[PDB]
Amino acid sequence: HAGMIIDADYITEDGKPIIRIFKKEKGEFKVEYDRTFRPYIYALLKDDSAIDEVKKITAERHGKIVRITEVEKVQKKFLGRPIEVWKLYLEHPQDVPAIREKIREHPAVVDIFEYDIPFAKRYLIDKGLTPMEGNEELTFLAVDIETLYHEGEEFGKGPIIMISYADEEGAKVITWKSIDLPYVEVVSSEREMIKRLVKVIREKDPDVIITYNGDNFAFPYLLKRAEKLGIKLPLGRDNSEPKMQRMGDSLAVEIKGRIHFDLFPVIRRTINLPTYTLEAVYEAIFGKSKEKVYAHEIAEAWETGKGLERVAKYSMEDAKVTFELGKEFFPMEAQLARLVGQPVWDVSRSSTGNLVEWFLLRKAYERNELAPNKPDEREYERRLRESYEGKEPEKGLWEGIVSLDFRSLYPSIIITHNVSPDTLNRENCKEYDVAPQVGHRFCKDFPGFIPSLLGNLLEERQKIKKRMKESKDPVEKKLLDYRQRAIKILANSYYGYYGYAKARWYCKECAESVTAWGRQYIDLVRRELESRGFKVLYIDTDGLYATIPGAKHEEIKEKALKFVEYINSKLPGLLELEYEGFYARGFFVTKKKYALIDEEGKIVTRGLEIVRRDWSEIAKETQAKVLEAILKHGNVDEAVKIVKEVTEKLSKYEIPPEKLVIYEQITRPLSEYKAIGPHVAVAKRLAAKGVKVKPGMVIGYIVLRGDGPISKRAIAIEEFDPKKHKYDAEYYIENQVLPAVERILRAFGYRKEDLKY
DNA sequence: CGATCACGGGG
DNA sequence: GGGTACGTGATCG
Ligand SMILES: [Mg+2]
Ligand SMILES: [Mg+2]
Numbered sequence: 093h094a095g096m097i098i099d100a101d102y103i104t105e106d107g108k109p110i111i112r113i114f115k116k117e118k119g120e121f122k123v124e125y126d127r128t129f130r131p132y133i134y135a136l137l138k139d140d141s142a143i144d145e146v147k148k149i150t151a152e153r154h155g156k157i158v159r160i161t162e163v164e165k166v167q168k169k170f171l172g173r174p175i176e177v178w179k180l181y182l183e184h185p186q187d188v189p190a191i192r193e194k195i196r197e198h199p200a201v202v203d204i205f206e207y208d209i210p211f212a213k214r215y216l217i218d219k220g221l222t223p224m225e226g227n228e229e230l231t232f233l234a235v236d237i238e239t240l241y242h243e244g245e246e247f248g249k250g251p252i253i254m255i256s257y258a259d260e261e262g263a264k265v266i267t268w269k270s271i272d273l274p275y276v277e278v279v280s281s282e283r284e285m286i287k288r289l290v291k292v293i294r295e296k297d298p299d300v301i302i303t304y305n306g307d308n309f310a311f312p313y314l315l316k317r318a319e320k321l322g323i324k325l326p327l328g329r330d331n332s333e334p335k336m337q338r339m340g341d342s343l344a345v346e347i348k349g350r351i352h353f354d355l356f357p358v359i360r361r362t363i364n365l366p367t368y369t370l371e372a373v374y375e376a377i378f379g380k381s382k383e384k385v386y387a388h389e390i391a392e393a394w395e396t397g398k399g400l401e402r403v404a405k406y407s408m409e410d411a412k413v414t415f416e417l418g419k420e421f422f423p424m425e426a427q428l429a430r431l432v433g434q435p436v437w438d439v440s441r442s443s444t445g446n447l448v449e450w451f452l453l454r455k456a457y458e459r460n461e462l463a464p465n466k467p468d469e470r471e472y473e474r475r476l477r478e479s480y481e482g483k484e485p486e487k488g489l490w491e492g493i494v495s496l497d498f499r500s501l502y503p504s505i506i507i508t509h510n511v512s513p514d515t516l517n518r519e520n521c522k523e524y525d526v527a528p529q530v531g532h533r534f535c536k537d538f539p540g541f542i543p544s545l546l547g548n549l550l551e552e553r554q555k556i557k558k559r560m561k562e563s564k565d566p567v568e569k570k571l572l573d574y575r576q577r578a579i580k581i582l583a584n585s586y587y588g589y590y591g592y593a594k595a596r597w598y599c600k601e602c603a604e605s606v607t608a609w610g611r612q613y614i615d616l617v618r619r620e621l622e623s624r625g626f627k628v629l630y631i632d633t634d635g636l637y638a639t640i641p642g643a644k645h646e647e648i649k650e651k652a653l654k655f656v657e658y659i660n661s662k663l664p665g666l667l668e669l670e671y672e673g674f675y676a677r678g679f680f681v682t683k684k685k686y687a688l689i690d691e692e693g694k695i696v697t698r699g700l701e702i703v704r705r706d707w708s709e710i711a712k713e714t715q716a717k718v719l720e721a722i723l724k725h726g727n728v729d730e731a732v733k734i735v736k737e738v739t740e741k742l743s744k745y746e747i748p749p750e751k752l753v754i755y756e757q758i759t760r761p762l763s764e765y766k767a768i769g770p771h772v773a774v775a776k777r778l779a780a781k782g783v784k785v786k787p788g789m790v791i792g793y794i795v796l797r798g799d800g801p802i803s804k805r806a807i808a809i810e811e812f813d814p815k816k817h818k819y820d821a822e823y824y825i826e827n828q829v830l831p832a833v834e835r836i837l838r839a840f841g842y843r844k845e846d847l848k849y
Numbered sequence: 850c851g852a853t854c855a856c857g858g859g860g
Numbered sequence: 861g862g863g864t865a866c867g868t869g870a871t872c873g
Contacts, residue, residue, distance in 0.1 A: 102861085131862065188862035208863055241860040250860080309859035340865030342857090356858050357865095368858060387860045443865080466863075594863095699868095704856045706870085756855060767853045767872045801872070827870080 095122055096228035097221060098299060098351060099435045100212040102185065107154075109184055111215050114329075114349050116228045116299060121329060121349065129215050130161070131185045134177040134205040134462060135195055140165070142200035143178055149198065151191035158187045170462045172514035172538065177205065177462065185211040205462050209453065216433060217454045224430040227571075230351075232422070233298035234258045234415035235289070237310050238407045240394055241387045243809075247788035248316030251282045253394050254404065255289045256411035259296065263412035266292075269394070271404045283321045286314065293327050301327075301347055302418030304370045304410070305356040307441075311345040312336060344441055351436050355414065358421050358440050366701040374413045377420060382413060427578040444585035445592040451582060452597055455545055464513075464596045475593040478600050482529055482608050485630040485637075485680030487839055489726060492645045493688065494652040495672040497635045498614060500580070502587035504667045505609045506602075507547050511590075512540025513599040527605035528612065534605070542597065546583060550666055553579040587633075607633060617659060617669060624655060630680040635672065637680065645691075649674055677723055681839045689723040702832055705755035705790070710747055711828035714738045718833045728840045735833050735847040742821045742829065749794060752819055753809050758789045770795065770806035778808060795820045802827075 095117030102109045111126040135146060143163055151158040162181040167174060180195065182188055192207045209217075216223070235257050240250035255266045265276045266285045279285045293301070303310050311334045318325050325333045329349025337344045345352055360368050363376060371382040385406035393399040422436075429439040432450045439447065456463045467475060505511070509525045511534055518524070518535035525534045534540070539547070556576040563569050589595055590603035610633065618628055621638055630637040640648050656671045663669070675696070678688035685699035697719070702712055714735060721730040741747050756771035762785055765772050771791040779785040792809035795802050797818045807817060825848075834844045 133862080182862085185862050190862095192862075206862085210862060212861095214862075237860080239860045245860095253860090303859095305858040307858090313860080337861080338864050341855095342865075344864095354858095360857085370858085390860065441865090446863085446865095449863095706855060759854080765854090769854070769871060771855090803872075831870090 093117065093122070093124065095120075096226045097216075097223040097435075098230070099223070099349075099437060100216055100221075101348070102211050102215075104184070107184065109211060111212065113221070116230065118228075121297070121299075123329075123349070126215070129211075129218070131182045131188055131211060131214070133180050133182075133188060133192060133195070133207040134166075134168075135180055136175065136177050136202040136205070138200050138202060142198075145200060146178070146195065146198060147180075149191065149194050151187070151194055153184075153186060153190040158182070158190050160191070168460050168462045171464075172518075172541065175462060203465075205465060208466065213434060213438075213450075217457045220458075222430060222433045223435045224426045230299040231297070232259060232300045232302055232415065232418055233293065233296055234302040234411050234418055235293075235306065235310065236304065236407065236410045236414055237313060238390060238403065238410075239313060240391055242391060243388075244790055244792060246784065246786045248313055248320070250391075252285065252313060252317050253282075253390070254407040255285055256407040257289070257292055258408075258411035258415040259298070263408045263415070265404050265407050265411075267404065267407075269397070269400060271400045273401060273404050273408075275408055276404050282317065283323060286318055286321065286323060286325070289314075290325060290327065297329075298350065300351045300353050300418070300422065302353050302355065302414050302422075304373075304414045304417070305354065306352065307339075307344045307354045307356070308342055311352075312343060339441065346437060353418060353422060353425070353436065353440060355417050355421060358425060359417070361443075362421065362424075364696065364698065366695075366697060367703045370410065370413065374417065377417065378413075382409060423574050424577065427574045428581065431575075431578045431582055444581065445589050445595065447582060448585050448589040449596060452542075452545070456541075459541070461541060466594060466596055467598070472593050475598060475600070480591075480600070480604050480607070482604065482611060483631060484682065485686070485839075486627070487841060489677060489679050489722060489728060489840070490629050490639055491677050491726075492643065492648045493629065493637050493639050493675040493678045494648060495635060495637055495675070496617070496652070496656070497670040497672045498610070498617075499584045499587075499634055500666070500668040500670065501610055501613055502606055503546050503550060503583045504665050505606050506586060507543045507550070508665070509605070509609055510534050510536055510540045510543045511602050511605055512542045513597055513602060515540040515543075516599065516601050527601075528608045530601070530604045530608050532601040532605045542586060542602075546586060549579050549583045553583070554666075613663070613667065620659060621655065624651060626651075626655075629678075630686060632683055637675075637678065637686075645674070645676075677726060679722065679836075679839045681835055685835065687719055687723060687836070693724070695719060695723055700836060707832070708754055708824065708828050709751040710738065710742070710824060711832040713751065714829050715832040715836070718836055722836070728837070731833075731837065732842065732847060735829065735837070736849055738829055739825045739848050742824050745818070745821065747824070749812060749814055749819060752794050752824060753792045754795070754806075755790050755792050757787075758785055758791060759787050761787070768803055770803045773803045774806050774808050795823045797821070 095115035097113055097115055099114040102111050111129050113124040115122040147160050147163045160180045161183055164179040166179050167176055188207055195201055196204045237252050238254035239252050257264055266288045268279050268281050268285050270278055279288055327334055327347050332348045335346045359373050365372055371384045374382045385403060390403050393403045425436050425440045429436045432439055432447050433454045434450045453463055515535040517533050521535040521537055523536040553576050556572050560569055560572045587606050590599045625640050626638045627641050628636055628638045653671055656669050659669050675688040676691050680686040687697040687700055689695050702715055717734045718731040721727050758775055762776055762779055770793055774791050774793045775785050793806040794812050796805045796807055797820045798805040830844050
């Protein structure tokens with residue numbers, strides 16, 4: 093029709109699938125239904141006569157037998173070669189996992205294809221439907237909750253004590269205790285507060301619900317408490333409840349007819365932070381501080397009734413900034429959805445590797461190219477163990493560091509050298525390009541599937557950039573700016589995608605060859621930098637860090653900016669080097685393990701910081717102190733003295749026991765564990781005392797002095813008696829503090845043995 | 850040793 | 861739900 097597609101799914105009616113297309117048409121919510129789309133897979137047979145045995149294969153599901161409804165002989169392309177496969181139709185999507193292995197096992201079946209694409213995604217591709225097209229303006233609502241938590245409680249034990257929401261009308265708090273603030277609505281109970289949230293959402297009818305970690309906290313918690321209280325959450329536009337989907341080891345929540353936009357996975361990919369707390373995230377984007385009110389402060393205020401205004405202000409600000417961040421990060425996710433042709437819900441929760449794959453599956457359909465299969469476990473494992481043919485960084489502390497980015501070099505290399513799995517070492521090829529050093533041959537006789545698509549993306553970006561220069565409308569310009577950035581992101585992900593172990597179009601030789609050709613330009617950049625007095629401190633496939641030893645910082649910045657402008661004038665086509673940034677100081681340990689500090693004093697690290705609950709505070713605190721001594725004080729000698737003093741204090745039992753607590757979650761019933769770690773040993777004793785130990789409960793423990801593995805010497809933090817129990821100083825030194833700092837201090841020539849008296 | 854198991858965000 | 865992360869490091873067995 094005319095509207096913007098925001099999502100798609102399927103429902104089953106009288107055992108048959110119905111596709112639903114969720115649309116927004118000039119401000120109105122619309123649902124279109126399609127009963128005609130049929131599930132299918134492909135089968136390559138040894139011979140056409142075999143179809144008579146294959147079409148008769150059956151399976152079982154929902155107490156009924158599953159059959160192939162129709163078969164169709166089709167002509168397609170596989171690896172740039174014509175192929176004849178049989179399209180096997182099935183009645184219901186759930187018939188595909190039930191029958192696919194019974195077809196694959198058949199002696200007449202060479203292989204099966206396209207048997208794991210979800211029905212709603214299969215529909216959008218086959219029908220040529222693209223989400224988020226048009227100038228349709230969506231409505232947004234941020235949602236958040238505060239709860240009553242005590243250390244180690246089962247998930248959902250304590251009530252929800254506040255629910256906050258925010259949009260352009262302001263930020264509001266719903267609570268069931270008397271708090272006298274203008275934005276606070278006081279209700280009678282937890283039940284009445286949850287029913288008020290339901291009413292707000294049904295009345296405001298937002299297209300987008302913005303949360304911060306709503307997938308794994310706010311919505312699973314609301315669902316747990318609504319279950320306990322025996323109330324429904326009809327938040328879906330079809331009155332359905334929020335739906336929890338197991339996405340990996342964690343969860344993802346969907347709200348039918350809407351976009352549940354969880355900012356946590358989105359921001360985690362976009363920017364680099366040691367910890368992605370809402371307060372750290374808000375400050376990195378808006379340059380303003382946000383106060384954190386910790387779980388224990390919240391519990392204390394609720395139970396004593398004192399200082400509840402502070403907790404209500406915290407709840408309000410949580411919703412307020414969640415709204416602000418949502419508006420900031422949504423436009424780019426909307427353009428990426430449009431580009432890849434899949435809904436924002438899915439696109440915002442996926443890696444760039446999956447964004448590339450979704451883009452390629454759609455283009456394969458458009459081009460009548462059969463998609464290769466995802467690897468089996470053994471192949472995936474064989475791919476992770478593959479070695480690539482074709483430096484370690486400078487030691488010590490460096491000053492005035494410029495960062496240069498190479499990533500925009502690789503799409504142009506893929507295109508000019510026709511680097512694709514369908515062009516690699518092709519038989520009876522008339523002309524080919526040979527990769528330097530690795531010698532892989534890529535046929536020049538026809539454009540490769542992936543170079544062809546990249547060429548079109550880069551051309552489309554150049555058109556957008558030209559239309560941007562010629563536009564007087566700042567609205568169109570803002571939108572076109574997002575569109576051209578989406579292409580840059582997608583195009584710059586192909587190099588990585590070639591080496592991604594889960595990729596359908598995985599190609600080790602393609603990745604290797606792009607690296608080998610890329611290196612010729614990197615070596616040119618390095619020689620040209622050194623001829624200009626620059627010293628290269630660190631270099632990898634993504635970029636480099638350099639300085640002019642002992643030069644004035646403004647001179648380094650000017651010379652680097654002049655260098656980038658010069659080299660890009662020398663580089664042919666769309667090969668581009670970028671000036672990324674400047675740092676006051678920094679040091680480099682190894683590949684993607686380094687730490688820097690900018691001119692505003694913000695520490696920036698990669699592959700070193702250990703901010704996680706399963707590491708003791710003493711190890712995390714010492715590591716922070718070491719990085720601060722090095723980057724803020726330019727003093728490695730102070731850092732070594734900090735480690736030496738901490739280790740002596742641990743040996744003389746001068747460290748508070750509270751800085752020694754280790755936290756680990758129970759993730760299954762205790763009887764299901766194959767290996768009993770210290771937290772499981774502690775948990776089993778707690779359950780033996782009558783504690784209801786459940787998956788989700790976090791176990792706090794201290795390692796005590798003694799013989800054997802740490803499993804037999806861990807004690808529950810609640811059972812620790814400082815007057816009776818002695819902590820293991822050698823464990824906290826050798827397994828906690830020293831591993832936290834040894835990688836960092838290796839960059840300065842220190843070994844683990846030199847960090848003690 | 851290989852196998853197993855945990856982390857993040859949120860209260 | 862025709863795709864159940866992601867990559868990495870500690871500890872058990
Ligand atoms: Mg969906
Ligand atoms: Mg909150």
